[PDB]
Write an enzyme that holds these catalytic residues in place. Structure first.
Site, PDB file in Angstrom:
ATOM      1  N   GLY A 257       0.833  -1.181   0.000  1.00  0.00           N
ATOM      2  CA  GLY A 257       0.000   0.000   0.000  1.00  0.00           C
ATOM      3  C   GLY A 257       0.878   1.244   0.000  1.00  0.00           C
ATOM      4  N   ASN A 260       3.963   5.207   5.428  1.00  0.00           N
ATOM      5  CA  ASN A 260       5.260   5.079   6.081  1.00  0.00           C
ATOM      6  C   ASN A 260       5.702   3.631   6.230  1.00  0.00           C
ATOM      7  OD1 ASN A 260       4.603   7.900   8.306  1.00  0.00           O
ATOM      8  ND2 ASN A 260       5.471   7.819   6.228  1.00  0.00           N
ATOM      9  N   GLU A 283      -0.666  -1.289  -6.995  1.00  0.00           N
ATOM     10  CA  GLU A 283      -1.739  -0.385  -7.358  1.00  0.00           C
ATOM     11  C   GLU A 283      -1.069   0.935  -7.676  1.00  0.00           C
ATOM     12  OE1 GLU A 283      -3.999  -1.292  -3.688  1.00  0.00           O
ATOM     13  OE2 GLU A 283      -5.727  -0.589  -4.860  1.00  0.00           O
ATOM     14  N   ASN A 373     -11.237   5.408   4.432  1.00  0.00           N
ATOM     15  CA  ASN A 373     -10.999   5.669   3.022  1.00  0.00           C
ATOM     16  C   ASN A 373     -11.880   4.735   2.209  1.00  0.00           C
ATOM     17  OD1 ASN A 373      -7.391   6.369   3.192  1.00  0.00           O
ATOM     18  ND2 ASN A 373      -9.185   7.627   3.632  1.00  0.00           N
ATOM     19  N   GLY A 377      -8.120  -1.849  -2.867  1.00  0.00           N
ATOM     20  CA  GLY A 377      -7.778  -3.068  -3.559  1.00  0.00           C
ATOM     21  C   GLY A 377      -7.184  -4.089  -2.600  1.00  0.00           C
TER      22      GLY A 377
END
Ligand SMILES: [Zn+2]
Ligand SMILES: [Zn+2]
Lengths: 496, 496
Positions: A257, A260, A283, A373, A377
């Site tokens: 993803g 950090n 992604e 959010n 995916g």
């Protein structure tokens, strides 16, 4: 011929109740000046007593000059499939609009299937638009080909900052639909199966707005010992799996993803010599990936968007010589495709808002009610990956909040899909374990010391069955946070 | 040469701590005499003070002469991936053994990946075993090819009742593994991509036990108005979707579970003329499918097993002239493959133990703790289907139990995967709806009148956010069942 207009003239082509699809994936590749013009127009209608809200279909998140402005304008009748803007997020959580997050890989085909109504107009950002209707996307693809195909009219935005020399970095296409669908011919993360542009009937282009919008620059990214720890654990686990024979010696494609932790993971992989040069089948491609790419650490990157800082994007555009053949952007229908992910044996690494002792993950709702959010995916990947991994610091709020709970207040991924969990404390391989065995593993390896004894006590509350969930107090952790502000104040004898 | 032995001699090749893989899918295609001989052997070791438990890998469920006898023998060290036997189920829920249910389509490859240890021996039921090691399965495939490949030694069971004329009804194979995997070439439910037999080194066959085991006969299957209703709703919804343009006019492949509802659904489809002759791409082919097949109602059936009554299996074997080219059995790696399911646009219809107002489904744990059977292939299908449907009578225990609850005590399928829910009361299309909108739809269309007002009151308890879950009482329904035995006795003011 192609007509050039203003962002104000273009906004006139959008009407109340129209469904609009936007190009790009994450701010990258998204229109930046027209949506704001729609907002003005929307507001001017509201204060006049007239209704004005549009349906919104996007790839993923959009800038603050898309969802933000549109949300502040209160012109969102419905939104899909993923968002990441504070104004829209509040609008949603206040129940002022309809939002439904979907598995990103499914929106394109489901649109074609007719599951969600009509697409009236498509607003897209372009690096080049031909007179014969050839569109060259910028840094994000999303559902571009589908919205351009389904939309009645298209509003193009020609960005100065993105050169047409980019031609070749995208692989655009759509597959036939059942019962006529064939296989998606990608057997390597760098395989091309489509075209470097999207073809439309130029007659559909109601106008081309010229813009000059640069990428934002990298904003404050401090290092954190907890993420350093997490990132190392991920990398060490993977090399350890290869030598154990559970991952092929030459490694596999990766997906991570944004954030950090992700950055730390990527850095760790690059610094662990036992991790062979690898490719990405993610992604979004971030700065961290580009950095490893320049060091030959990452050989190639497949994604849906190139979400990098201004300094990085300028370096790429100044060196297409090096990056052009190493980066490939695809529509999310392909970048997140279950078929491709499972075939390539993509190793997925995603974050968790919270996780429970039985391997279930929550990646969207705070306290089970407040949207974050969207599932994104994480489902497309986790579910079909060679091995799915979830990372997360063990605690939060100076330790007053535990990332691990008896039961997740919202289930996004189940015990059947989550294979490995990793925090700064260690890794919990969940494979081949029943509920009780994976709870003890998660407790001993991932949970923060301050919560390990309490979760161990939870497993001894007398509950009978395959899964020791105590419906009388499985949410005591969340309940206590609301009561005291510190989950450590929980005492099972108090919650029963 | 092939050595013929007894079920007792064969059992000697199985030792304590050995991992055994069994052929078949559901009782169909499973060994029936050797596992019982292992049990005797296991018990004889126990009462002698010696330990004796084997690891078990199967396709899905097995007869009572497999899991049952082995469970009664207390010789199960661990079990995967799906079971359906009362003795084993209790052994599990009493925490006397380790069980972990997996998505059926993933066990084969994960075995090859080395995720679960070694396969010491494979016990298989056959219709014919060649001297050069060619195996012809019977009525169930499961993970046959994988266990035969990975096992150190194979114990074959040659059943009298299954003719070698069946040759051709199976499509056996395995794909290369990453990073060398290619696409799975099935673009139609009747496409063949493998061989009608599995090839092994005859040297691995430690013995062939001759058996003569007939299929059980159909046992009491009364009609029920609630299932008649449910089945009709499913069929009417589907024709309605085709005319709405949300499903192609020629229909799509179908998948349904096993049970009375499933039987009702299949019957309804066959009796609704607006439903065109269709094909199945399911897990298990039941009598109901065969019946529609003989009426030309079902054109072809792809599955992992042919689980039919003795009367039906004899009719098929007496008419290979008609059935041979209409039935095709595949390993669950293929019958439940996400790639195939999504490409073909398979419409999936599965059952729910319970469901909540936000579209989440529980298909395995009673009250969230007691294991039922296993997630099975409901995830493989639901997640990737063209449109996923879940059926379930609205109530249970003379109305004292509601199939619909505020929150499911166990999450197997999420809001992001469940598209449609159907009970005897009507259908709730969840597509394009946020949490609140799909809760009202589910309440008004699927929930039983006796629980609709109570669940409507649950949505007005003051909770803020995207999802109105009240962590203080989301499990009041389940809690009340345990307290009063009747969920209708719930009063939110009592649970807060
Ligand atoms: Zn969710
Ligand atoms: Zn489960």
């Amino acid at each position: 011929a192609l007509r050039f207009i203003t962002a104000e003239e273009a906004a006139e082509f959008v009407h109340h109740n129209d469904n609009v699809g936007f190009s790009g994936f994450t701010p990258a590749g998204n229109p930046k000046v027209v949506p704001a013009a729609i907002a003005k127009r929307a507001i001017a209608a509201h204060e006049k007593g007239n209704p004005f809200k549009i349906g919104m279909f996007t790839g993923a998140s959009t800038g603050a000059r898309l969802d933000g402005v549109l949300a502040q304008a209160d012109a969102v009748k419905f939104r899909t499939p993923y968002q990441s803007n504070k104004d829209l997020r509040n609008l949603i959580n206040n129940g002022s609009t309809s939002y439904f997050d979907l598995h990103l890989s499914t929106l394109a085909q489901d649109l074609r299937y007719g599951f969600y109504g009509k697409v009236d107009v498509a607003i897209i950002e372009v690096a080049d638009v031909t007179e014969d209707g050839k569109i060259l996307p910028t840094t994000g693809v999303g559902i571009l080909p589908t919205i351009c195909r389904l939309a009645d009219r298209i509003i193009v935005e020609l960005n100065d900052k993105h050169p047409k020399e980019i031609m070749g970095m995208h692989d655009l296409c759509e597959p036939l639909d059942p019962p006529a669908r064939r296989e998606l011919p990608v057997y390597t993360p760098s395989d091309r199966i489509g075209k470097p542009y999207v073809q439309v009937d130029p007659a559909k282009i109601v106008g081309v707005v010229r813009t000059s919008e640069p990428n934002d620059e990298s904003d404050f990214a401090p290092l954190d010992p907890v993420t350093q720890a997490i990132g190392d654990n991920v990398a060490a686990f993977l090399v350890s799996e290869m030598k154990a024979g559970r991952i092929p010696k030459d490694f596999l494609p990766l997906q991570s993803g944004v954030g950090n932790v992700a950055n730390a993971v990527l850095g760790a992989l690059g610094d662990n010599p036992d991790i062979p040069a690898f490719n990405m089948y993610t992604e979004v491609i971030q700065d961290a990936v580009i950095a490893l790419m320049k060091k030959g650490r990452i050989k190639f990157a497949s994604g849906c968007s190139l979400s990098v800082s201004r300094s990085v994007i300028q370096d790429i555009y100044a060196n297409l010589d090096f990056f052009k053949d190493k980066i490939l952007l695809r529509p999310q229908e392909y970048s997140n495709n279950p078929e491709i992910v499972r075939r390539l044996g993509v190793i997925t690494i995603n974050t968790a808002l919270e996780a429970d002792i039985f391997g279930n993950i929550n990646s969207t709702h705070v306290s089970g009610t407040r949207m974050m959010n969207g599932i994104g995916g994480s489902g497309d990947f986790t579910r079909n990956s060679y091995v799915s991994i979830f990372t997360t610091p063990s605690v939060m709020k100076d330790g007053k909040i535990s990332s691990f709970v008896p039961m997740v207040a919202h289930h996004d991924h189940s015990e059947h899909s989550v294979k490995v969990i990793i925090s700064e404390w260690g890794v919990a391989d969940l494979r081949g374990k029943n509920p009780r065995e994976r709870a003890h593993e998660i407790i001993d390896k991932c949970v923060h010391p301050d919560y390990r004894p309490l979760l161990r006590q939870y497993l001894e509350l007398g509950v009978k069955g395959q899964t020791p969930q105590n419906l009388d107090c499985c949410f005591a952790f969340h309940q206590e946070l609301a009561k005291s502000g510190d989950m450590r104040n929980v005492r099972w004898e108090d919650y029963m």
